[PDB]
């Protein structure tokens, strides 16, 4: 030996590893591994979790009669609020399972691990000496997860207001959220929608255009590695029917005539989009709701005329009253 520390540092920072294990990665594997082992055990076999603190539970496990679509990891009890609730603060194992302990374990380790993934990205890109900005493009789903799992709960006052980890659980969260805050008319959610449809659309456009122009591609290969001449043949003419549509829309909006603005714009669109909606979800965490119109049209007789906004307010009311077991005397509320 050379005294294990020197071997250990070479082992960690090696880029000849099949899977890079950096110094972020050294935190990342235990956290992500804990999160996933707890998740699959909980999803399969966590007994029903009381979620309103009235001793009426909800089953999310698969051995208690769910399928893939109806199952979930049920969030923490409403009694707990925002308290930190490790397993040694409970007094028995069965009551830690009855109050929804594991859910907090999963999300805390998951956010740590998914942050370290971004770190590990930045570090490896630093070793190969390339412009390290793949990480800022990833910071958009990461920002989104902070907003949905950590911040909206804090803003409302409890982790009982978090998103369940399950398929129908997400749908339940979405519907209830629209009921209490009117997300559709929030302009930031609109920026979000725009961003992901536009991302999908520009993905199809780019792909279709590129695969029509490529001709043949070959790069020299050796018996242990790769070559140093990347050959590539493409078509190099286009017509004036993609000059009134593509040419004088893109040269004018990109602010360049250069091809290097294509791939800069491709990533900018959805990233900005998902930041905007990630920001919006947090502003409703402090209850700044979106536009809603009731009684924006009245005639000069003094009778009200309805509009589409009022129909959506009716449907929202319908969802919202169904969500409320707690009392029938509630005038003005949340949080």
């Amino acid at each position: 030996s050379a005294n294990l520390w020197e071997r250990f540092c070479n082992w960690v920072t090696s880029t000849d590893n099949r899977l890079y294990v950096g110094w972020f990665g050294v935190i990342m594997i235990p956290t992500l591994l804990a999160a996933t082992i707890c998740f699959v055990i909980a999803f399969i076999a966590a007994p029903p979790v009381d979620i309103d603190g009235i001793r009426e539970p909800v089953s999310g496990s698969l051995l208690y009669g769910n399928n893939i679509i109806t199952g979930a990891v049920v969030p923490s009890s409403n009694a707990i609020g925002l308290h930190f609730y490790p397993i040694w603060e409970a007094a028995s194992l069965d009551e830690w399972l009855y109050n929804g302990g594991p859910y907090q374990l999963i999300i805390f380790h998951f956010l740590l691990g998914a942050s370290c993934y971004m770190g590990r990205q930045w570090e490896l890109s630093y070793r190969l000496g390339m412009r390290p900005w793949i990480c800022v493009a990833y910071s958009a789903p990461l920002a989104s997860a902070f907003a949905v799992f950590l911040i909206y709960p804090i803003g409302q006052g409890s982790f009982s207001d978090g998103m369940p980890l399950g398929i129908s659980g997400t749908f339940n969260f979405m519907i209830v959220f629209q009921a209490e805050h009117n997300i559709l008319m929030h302009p930031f959610h609109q920026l979000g929608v725009a961003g992901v449809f536009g991302g999908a659309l520009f993905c199809a456009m780019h792909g279709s255009l590129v695969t029509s122009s490529l001709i043949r591609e070959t790069t020299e290969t050796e018996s242990a590695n790769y070559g140093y001449k990347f050959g590539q043949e493409e078509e190099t003419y286009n017509i004036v029917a993609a000059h009134g549509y593509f040419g004088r829309l893109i040269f004018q909006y990109a602010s360049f005539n250069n091809s290097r603005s294509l791939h800069f714009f491709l990533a900018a669109w959805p990233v900005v989009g998902v930041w905007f909606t990630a920001l919006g979800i947090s502003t409703m965490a402090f209850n700044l709701n979106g536009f809603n119109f009731n009684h924006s049209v009245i005639d000069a007789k003094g009778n009200v005329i309805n509009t589409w906004a009022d129909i959506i307010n009716r449907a929202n009311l319908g969802m919202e009253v169904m969500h409320e077991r707690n009392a029938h005397n509630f005038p003005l509320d949340l949080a």
């Binding site: 110094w23 050294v26 490790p86 397993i87 040694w88």
Partner: peptide, 26 residues
């Protein structure tokens, strides 16, 4: 149930200390 408390503290400080000593190990 308290042995659990100390085993998580201990294993956690181990991982955190090797990460912070790692960035100073060049």
């Amino acid at each position: 149930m308290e042995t659990l408390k100390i085993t998580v503290y201990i294993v956690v400080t181990f991982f955190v200390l090797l990460f912070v000593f790692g960035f100073l190990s060049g």
